[PDB]
Every structure is written in C-alpha cells, then in structure tokens.
Amino acid sequence: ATKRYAVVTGANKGIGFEICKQLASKGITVILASRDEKRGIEARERLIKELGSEFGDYVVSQQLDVADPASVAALVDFIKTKFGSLDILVNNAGLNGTYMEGDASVLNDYVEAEFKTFQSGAAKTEPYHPKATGRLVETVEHAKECIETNYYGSKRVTEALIPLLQQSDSPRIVNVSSTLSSLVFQTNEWAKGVFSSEEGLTEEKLEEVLAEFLKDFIDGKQQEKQWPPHFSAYKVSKAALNAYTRIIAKKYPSFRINAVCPTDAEAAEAPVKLALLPQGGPSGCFFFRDEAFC
Numbered sequence: 001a002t003k004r005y006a007v008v009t010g011a012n013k014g015i016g017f018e019i020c021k022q023l024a025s026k027g028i029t030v031i032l033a034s035r036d037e038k039r040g041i042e043a044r045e046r047l048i049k050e051l052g053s054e055f056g057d058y059v060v061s062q063q064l065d066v067a068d069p070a071s072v073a074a075l076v077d078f079i080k081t082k083f084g085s086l087d088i089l090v091n092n093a094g095l096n097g098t099y100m101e102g103d104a105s106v107l108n109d110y111v112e113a114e115f116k117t118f119q120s121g122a123a124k125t126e127p128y129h130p131k132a133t134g135r136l137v138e139t140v141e142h143a144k145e146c147i148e149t150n151y152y153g154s155k156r157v158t159e160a161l162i163p164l165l166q167q168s169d170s171p172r173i174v175n176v177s178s179t180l181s182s183l184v185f186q187t188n189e190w191a192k193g194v195f196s197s198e199e200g201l202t203e204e205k206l207e208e209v210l211a212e213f214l215k216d217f218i219d220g221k222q223q224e225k226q227w228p229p230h231f232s233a234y235k236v237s238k239a240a241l242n243a244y245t246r247i248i249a250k251k252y253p254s255f256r257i258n259a260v261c262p263t264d265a266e267a268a269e270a271p272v273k274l275a276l277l278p279q280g281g282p283s284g285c286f287f288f289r290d291e292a293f294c
C-alpha cells in the first residue's frame with residue numbers, strides 16, 4: 001500500500017530489466033539505472049509499452065556507472081531531489097571478467113565443468129580447456145574491471161544510498177551474486193579461510209584478499225598460488241560480495257540485506273521476493289533461487 005522507491009543497477013537488459021518490470025508491476029516506483037543513458041531510456045520505453053502507459057510514472061531512467069564516483073553521486077542527488085526517499089536497492093550490475101575466443105558456445109563446456117564441482121566437491125586447480133574450437137580468455141585488465149565493478153562498484157553504490165535507505169521504515173538491499181561464489185570453488189586456502197570467517201571478518205580482510213588475488217594475477221602466478229583456474233576474478237569478487245553482504249547485514253540490523261543466486265523473468269523472481277521481503281525475513285544470507293541458507 002505504502003509508496004516505495006527502488007533502485008535497480010545494471011537494469012537496461014537481462015535480469016535487472018526483469019527485476020524492474022516486476023517491481024513496477026507491484027506498485028513500486030523504480031529507478032532503472034544503466035551504464036549508458038540512451039539504452040536505459042530505451043529500456044524504459046519497452047518496459048512501459050509492455051506494462052501499459054499507466055505505469056509511465058512508476059519507471060524512471062537514470063544513468064549510473066557503479067565504477068564512477070561522480071555517476072554515483074549524481075544518482076544520490078537525483079533521488080534526493082526527485083523523491084526524497086529510498087526503500088530498496090538491487091545491486092545487479094555485474095561483470096564476468098571473461099570472454100570467448102572462437103566458437104562462443106564452448107562456454108557451455110566451461111560452465112559444465114565448473115558445475116560438476118557441486119556434485120563432487122573436487123575443486124580442480126589446474127586449467128582445463130575443453131576444446132580448441134573456443135577458449136575462455138581472462139585478461140588482467142578484465143580481472144581488474146571485474147573486481148572493481150562487482151565488489152567495489154556494489155559497495156560504492158550501497159554506501160552512497162545507505163543514508164537515504166536508513167530513513168525507510170523497511171530498508172531492503174539485495175545483492176545479485178552467483179553460484180560461482182560458493183566456497184567449493186575457492187581453491188586458495190588462505191582466501192577460503194577469510195571468506196568462511198563468521199567472527200572477526202572485516203572489510204579490510206576482504207580487500208586484502210582482493211589485492212592479493214590481483215597481485216598474483218598480474219604476476220602470472222594464478223596456478224602457483226592455488227587461485228581458481230577459470231572464472232577466477234568472478235569467483236573471488238562474488239565471494240567477497242557475499243562476505244561483504246554479511247558484514248553490512250550485522251552493521252544495519254534494522255535493514256534486510258541479502259545475496260541471491262538468480263529465462264530472465266523466472267530468474268528475477270528470487271531477487272524480487274527479497275526486495276519485498278517482510279520485516280521478519282532473514283538478513284545476512286546467501287539464497288539460491290528460492291531457498292533459505294543463512
């Protein structure tokens with residue numbers, strides 16, 4: 001009943017777009033944030049054409065690059081002067097840190113090899129490329145961008161909007177993570193120990209793991225130092241984001257702060273449920289689709 005305002009980052013396509021659609025259809029007023037201003041304007045138009053023109057006031061486009069402090073600051077100013085309030089943040093903007101050379105479909109072979117680790121717990125530490133048809137390339141610069149967006153980007157946006165969210169009588173933060181965030185994939189025993197800590201976990205320790213991974217990745221010692229052979233930056237960054245989610249869950253008990261592994265419309269249901277979570281919902285948990293954990 002009570003009017004709510006939500007930010008969804010990286011929301012011009014993919015699951016973000018579907019999160020926005022589903023919040024707007026429930027009466028939430030949504031800020032559709034996109035790295036490029038014109039694609040977000042265009043995404044809003046399609047969103048309004050699909051829901052109906054009566055939703056035109058419930059969706060607003062705003063440029064947002066989570067890696068750019070000035071972009072973040074401009075978004076806080078926009079929300080301040082247009083609405084005055086914020087209730088929901090969905091951190092959906094994200095990068096893989098990888099691309100395909102050659103046949104792009106070999107990616108399904110790489111994703112398959114990772115997913116068997118769930119059925120076996122045997123976390124391979126040696127790089128295995130399933131075919132010579134394609135290759136999953138992970139450059140040093142893409143590893144930096146991936147950490148800078150997934151960890152520091154999400155954290156930058158969260159801390160800029162917390163002051164606004166804290167004036168909500170039910171503030172909600174949802175961090176879109178990945179199954180590759182699971183510690184079964186964290187080959188590096190030091191880093192796994194940090195991520196596993198329930199006591200004495202600090203943002204400082206998380207950032208030390210990130211810097212250590214980036215130093216060994218630059219130095220070319222990814223396998224020497226027992227870092228994951230594939231999706232390496234992605235795994236470390238999304239695990240850090242999970243751990244960071246628990247840290248701020250404990251800092252702000254009056255908030256509900258959660259991570260969630262997510263067709264796109266179906267995958268948006270899980271973050272959407274967490275964005276409208278009741279007062280007694282959990283906080284500090286990583287959810288797989290629609291199932292509890294904490």
Ligand SMILES: NC(=O)c1ccc[n+]([C@@H]2O[C@H](COP(=O)([O-])OP(=O)(O)OC[C@H]3O[C@@H](n4cnc5c(N)ncnc54)[C@H](OP(=O)(O)O)[C@@H]3O)[C@@H](O)[C@H]2O)c1
Nearest residue numbers: 010011013014015035036064065066067092093094177178
């Ligand atoms: N593929 C899956 O089914 C799957 C599975 C598990 C987890 N996820 C997670 O779910 C989220 C949604 O991704 P997706 O699968 O829908 O992929 P996607 O289509 O590539 O969407 C990612 C979105 O993030 C935006 N983005 C990236 N870097 C940004 C930055 N610097 N600042 C602001 N926006 C930025 C992109 O904007 P541009 O269009 O301007 O590039 C894009 O709209 C991600 O966080 C991803 O890690 C996805």
